[PDB]
Amino acid sequence: VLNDILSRLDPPEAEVQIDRLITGRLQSLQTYVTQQLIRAAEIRASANL
């Protein structure tokens, strides 16, 4: 939970913890976007058929 970190720690370590969280969530989002792109390519092939 971002709010817990931002309430329990000061910037010098809060920003490291938030760096870790941002890295994880950004990797998750990029994976999701790649999956959506692939599935949309499949669905567009089906739509053209």
Binding site: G24, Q27, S28, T31, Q35
Partner: protein, 48 residues
């Protein structure tokens, strides 16, 4: 039809490594599901 054991590949026979990997959530499940989907797609391709 390749299939990769995510937890065994990343964290081969290490309980501590598995506990650390659990911090990353469902990534392993995503990869395994994707590979299973590919395998099923291949069998569907051959069948059709």
């Amino acid at each position: 039809k390749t299939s990769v054991d995510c937890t065994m590949y990343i964290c081969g026979d290490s309980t501590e490594c598995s506990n650390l990997l659990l911090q990353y959530g469902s990534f392993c499940t995503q990869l395994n599901r994707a590979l299973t989907g590919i395998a099923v797609e291949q069998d569907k391709n051959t069948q059709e």
